[PDB]
Amino acid sequence: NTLDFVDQASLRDDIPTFSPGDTVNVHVKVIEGSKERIQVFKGVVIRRQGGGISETFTVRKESYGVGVERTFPVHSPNIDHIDVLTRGDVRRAKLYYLRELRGKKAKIKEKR
Amino acid sequence: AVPKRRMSRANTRSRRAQWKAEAPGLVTVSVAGQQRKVPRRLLKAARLGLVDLD
Amino acid sequence: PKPTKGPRLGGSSSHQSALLANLATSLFEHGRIKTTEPKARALRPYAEKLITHAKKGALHNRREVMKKIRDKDVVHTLFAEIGPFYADRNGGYTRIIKVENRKGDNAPMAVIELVRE
Amino acid sequence: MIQQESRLKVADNTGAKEILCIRVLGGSSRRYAGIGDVIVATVKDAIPGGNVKRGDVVKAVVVRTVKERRRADGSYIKFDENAAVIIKNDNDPRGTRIFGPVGRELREKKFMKIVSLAPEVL
Amino acid sequence: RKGILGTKLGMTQVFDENNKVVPVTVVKAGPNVVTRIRTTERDGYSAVQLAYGEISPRKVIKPVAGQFAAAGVNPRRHVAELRLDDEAAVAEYEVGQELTAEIFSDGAYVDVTGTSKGKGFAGTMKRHGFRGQGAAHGAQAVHRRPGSIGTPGRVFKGTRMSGRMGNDRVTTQNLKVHKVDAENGVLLIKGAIPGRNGGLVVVRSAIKR
């Protein structure tokens, strides 16, 4: 992967192990009139498109009756820390079917 | 569309002269002792006895 | 392996699959077959990977081969001598020899055979 | 991506339930309206007792889009519906209450009142 | 105006100090050796000729080997010329001098020149962005053809009709160099530079910025 020597310089460690299906809350720093604060996005990791530095993962959450999806680069410095709450039990690599499910049907089994 | 006019002999011959065949190149090979010409594309096969030589 | 860039061999993908499986069957059954040069060119990697499956001969690999070969005698030969024969050769189980063009349609012919050196 | 003849739900309490996009303001022959764009819209569905009426030509701002929208930092935001909030010429809501989340793009477009009224800004 | 010959490696992702993402194309600005000086008193124009790439000495034909020997340097695969403006500008290069990546600095604006990808025989829809005709409402076998060609009954020259597309030298202007990695001789250029991976490119200081 010829560009690996370029890549590893910006690669970011300390990233927790997680898979599509787990429920995580992402600590995202934002700008609100030139001051810092961390906005926590808690939802379900519905996908993860491996690319090394260009790795991206998607977290889906239901908020005030409207579903919201957010895609972040895995090694984005804009994420100070990721915390994994629960491990989900799923049979797919990408959970796109969850875009059509609400409430009771949208729940995820828990890895026991 | 249909040809409006009959081609003259010069134009017909000039265009017709492009329809021709090129001569394949031949290399020498020794099969059963006797030398004979074979295309270089078939050299290995001739050396293996896989092409009929009349 | 690498899918064909152009249109398929038999005139459709399913026909090409059947063609390739039959050609591999005949190749392993006889040891050398004569066919058009595009057919041998497409046949090389396919037969080479079937032989690779046969080399590490387990039940899983046997079933992997059977899901393509469909002929049980050929599978038995492939897992009984062809596999063990190539135990210590890494790739290049087949060779292609170009032969004289066909008469009916001037199709370039080629002969594909297993190496026995 | 909202264009002409597209329908949007109303995220306000003005009595309008659903509007049809007429124009995308912001330059001649402009095509699509993303989060934070102002559109001219006509009310298609309304609450029977509301202040607005069907067929009113109003000005609205898009606050949610189904098509994901890239951000400066390489992250993306995507919602489940296209929603708009009816405004007046001074860029303030004509309603008093905003429903559902909104995008961060309403900050750089100077929709401060809509941002403040929203339940949460993403 | 500085310049160097390089090779397109691929494109990747980096983040600047405001945490924004920068899509960067990696160019191998490998070592170039100056082979010839073009002077006004000799050639009529001032320019400098650079050699790039590594090639086996048994692959170069005799004329090329003789030219490289006359220069005094070992042969390289690729040769190209940089056209300067005046003798005062070309006085700073001399034959055998080696140019590496650090002639550029971070944040500089550069001009990358390469050969575009080949697209083959292309229709007017793709070659020229012609709007098509209707796909229904009675349109008969005209879904992609140009249509009219438009007193003298003559098709004027320059007709934007179908033909071969691509494979032309292209210059992209005002690209910003995000980082100059001196260790690997690699330039990180923000944006997309012409050509396929492994092709030859020329990196020059921008003429405008």
Place this chain on the structure above:
RNA sequence: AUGGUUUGGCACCUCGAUGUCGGCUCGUCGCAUCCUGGGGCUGGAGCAGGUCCCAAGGGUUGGGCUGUUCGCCCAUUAAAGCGGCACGCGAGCUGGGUUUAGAACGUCGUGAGACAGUUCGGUCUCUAUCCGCCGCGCGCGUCAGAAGCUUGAGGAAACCUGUCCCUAGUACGAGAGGACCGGGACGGACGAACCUCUGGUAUACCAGUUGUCCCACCAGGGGCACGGCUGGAUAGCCACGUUCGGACAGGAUAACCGCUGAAAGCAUCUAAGCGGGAAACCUCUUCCAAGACCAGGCUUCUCACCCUCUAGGAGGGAUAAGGCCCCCCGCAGACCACGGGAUUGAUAGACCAGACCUGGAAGCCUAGUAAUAGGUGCAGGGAACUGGCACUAACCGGCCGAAAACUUAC
């Protein structure tokens, strides 16, 4: 007075056929300029206009109604220009209107029938010879044969614009209102390159599953049903995605503002002269370009061997540098061409490993009456991307391919 863009008039042109309106697609030209650019007087205080000169570089929206052009209207916009070219464009498309045969209404006619009145329905043929144009080769030429790198005469492309922030709430103005000049950011539309991201596609990828047949049977699989149907889907191609562009500067100018002054003792931007002055022009940016017959330049390589006629020239043969064919290929490609490799080899395939996609293989064991679940186990399977590896194929090979001299000057 202009024009033949409107109805005309003539009947010169065609009845051994010149498609009749709009619309779509694609243009090209004019300037009698809609915006942007430079101006001037204002019945111009500023803002904003009015009107007028220069100016054709670019741009000039999407819908409702109607077959429509036209037109009215709805939202915008910097603006929603007017015209020529068979009222451009049917061997490019449409057939809604008009313009055959069917049928009805109103009216006319005793009637057959009729109506530059209405209404519903109603076959749009063709394998491109030549010119033209877009691309691509072969041959020859450029005074020996070749090979690198190039100059450029000459052409082509591109040229749009808004909002906001500072200057400045100042100049002006009773106030309201509202600046000039100059810097900065973010946009719309258009164009190009590209595939890191997003998204699309995926007919040799992975998994689920219905019906049926087969592999003796169970298990496990396979063929067919749009790839049977579904869930995903790397590479390539792409846009809905990313990045970049329109410049800056110089020269000569238009309308115009001027300087220095004659004829014409003053005056006069003028007849001598000299200056400023625009998106137009020439350069400037990008691209093609020596078939540029004035067929260019800087270099580098080979730089020699026979035979025949008759020794005048010619013809033939064999070679060098080099090239081509055959061969292995390519993200180069209709073919051809182009580019790379050819054993002194990583060009392709295989093999090994990785990346990535899928999502937990088979067998066995355990739990359950069974459907099924757990362990072995980030398992197994696999294309394009990357790195190794001569294992297979690039081969004991053919064809092309180098110099009359003379004149003058030095």
